[PDB]
From a paper:
The essential enzyme messenger RNA (mRNA) (guanine-N7) methyltransferase catalyzes S-adenosylmethionine (SAM)-dependent conversion of GpppRNA ends to the m7GpppRNA cap structure characteristic of eukaryal mRNAs. The antibiotic sinefungin (SFG) is a SAM analog in which the S-CH3 sulfonium moiety of SAM is replaced by a C-NH2 amine. Available evidence indicates that the antifungal activity of SFG is exerted via inhibition of fungal cap methyltransferase Abd1. Crystal structures of K. lactis and S. cerevisiae Abd1 as binary complexes with SAH or SFG and ternary complexes with GTP•SFG highlight how SFG makes two hydrogen bonds from its C-NH2 amine to the guanine-O6 and -N7 atoms of GTP that account for its higher affinity vis-à-vis SAH and SAM.
To elucidate the role of Tyr416 substitutions in ScAbd1 in conferring SFG resistance, ScAbd1Δ140-K163R-K311R-F387Y-Y416F was purified and co-crystallized in the presence of 1 mM SFG and 3 mM GTP. The structure was refined at a resolution of 2.8 Å with Rwork/Rfree of 18.2/21.7. The crystals contained three ScAbd1 complexes in the asymmetric unit and the tertiary structures of the protomers are very similar to each other (r.m.s.d. between 0.21 and 0.25 Å over 256 Cα positions). SFG engages with the same ensemble of enzymic residues observed in the wild-type ScAbd1•SFG•GTP structure and the C-NH2 amine of SFG makes hydrogen bonds with the O6 (2.9 Å) and N7 (2.5 Å) atoms of GTP, à la the wild-type structure. Whereas the GTP contacts in the SFG-resistant ScAbd1 recapitulate many of those seen in the wild-type ternary complex, there are some noteworthy differences. First, only one of the Glu347 carboxylate oxygens is coordinating the guanine-N1 (2.8 Å) and -N2 (3.2 Å) atoms. Second, there is no contact between His253 and guanine-O6 in the variant complex. Third, and most relevant, the Tyr416 phenolic hydroxyl-mediated polar contacts with the guanine-N3 and ribose-O2′ atoms of GTP observed in the wild-type active site are missing in the SFG-resistant variant in which Tyr416 is changed to Phe. Absence of the two hydrogen bonds between GTP and Tyr416 is likely to reduce the cap binding affinity of the SFG-resistant variants. In addition, whereas the electron densities for Phe416 and SFG in the resistant variant are well defined, the density for GTP is relatively weak, specifically around the guanosine and ribose moieties, when compared to the GTP density in the wild-type ternary complex.
Numbering used by the authors: 141 to 435
Write the structure that this text describes.
Amino acid sequence: SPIIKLRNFNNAIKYMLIDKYTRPGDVVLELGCGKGGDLRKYGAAGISQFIGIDISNASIQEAHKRYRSMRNLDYQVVLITGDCFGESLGVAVEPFPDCRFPCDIVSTQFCLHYAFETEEKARRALLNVAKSLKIGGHFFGTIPDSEFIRYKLNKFPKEVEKPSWGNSIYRVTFENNSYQKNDYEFTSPYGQMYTYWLEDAIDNVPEYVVPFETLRSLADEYGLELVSQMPFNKFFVQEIPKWIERYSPKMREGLQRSDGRYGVEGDEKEAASYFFTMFAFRKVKQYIEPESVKP
Ligand SMILES: Nc1nc2c(ncn2[C@@H]2O[C@H](COP(=O)(O)OP(=O)(O)OP(=O)(O)O)[C@@H](O)[C@H]2O)c(=O)[nH]1
Ligand SMILES: Nc1ncnc2c1ncn2[C@@H]1O[C@H](C[C@@H](N)CC[C@H](N)C(=O)O)[C@@H](O)[C@H]1O
């Protein structure tokens, strides 16, 4: 099953990412945490506290009722319904004094692209991330690669109204063709909508492009310096050497091609390894808002 291979691969990527930046005793803030898909991964890292926030009350309840159903829970868990992009994060976390801010890690797995709906939303999300971190703390995540998206968008003539591409397990469909009509450049960093379909996961839901240059430039304004940016395919090849020993025999088989080498082939190759990038930033400065220091 191709979609299974993709799920396996994307979980391997998340392990590689989490265990690279997260250290024993860390406090972790997972924005857009969904249904607690990444709890086991933070366990291996040896964290102290996990703080999950998601806008969907349904998802948080499935997260609560599921943490109980696992062994080796050596860490405190706080799960919160809240909007991490549209609203200040202090709104969401004030009712939860247990939370130990500032924290060591902020993670956004497959969600930061919902924040690029508007400039206002993108700036709050990043200010939320920056406000939350110790200096020396890391913000890491996974988003669609704007460079892969540009590569594909560049291949369409101006005639095509709603540019679309995909394969058997995924499809992207752009709202308009303003990119092509604007000499193969976005009119704006924000609000660049496309509909994403992934087999048995996302059902034609609107997302936004994240021009990596804009993410990097906003992060800098708020005191985050980029320390790594790699597409999944390149990230995996770099990290896989130190993971083969740690994979269980069944985990090994789910990450192997039919020839026995490690990786993805076929439709998964594009849908998983080319379409997504990881990133990691380090907080280097404490942000102070312009014109905010008064007598
Ligand atoms: N573009 C995009 N992809 C997403 C988003 N959310 C999830 N995905 C992708 O959906 C894939 C599969 O999601 P699910 O099938 O729900 O994965 P899961 O709950 O971890 O399931 P198992 O891996 O089987 O335990 C992930 O590996 C991501 O690549 C999103 O908001 N945007
Ligand atoms: N403004 C928002 N604030 C918080 N969560 C949001 C917001 N917008 C979307 N989300 C959530 O982001 C999640 C996106 C999921 N694709 C990711 C879940 C999980 N992190 C994973 O690795 O799959 C969903 O659970 C959404 O409800």
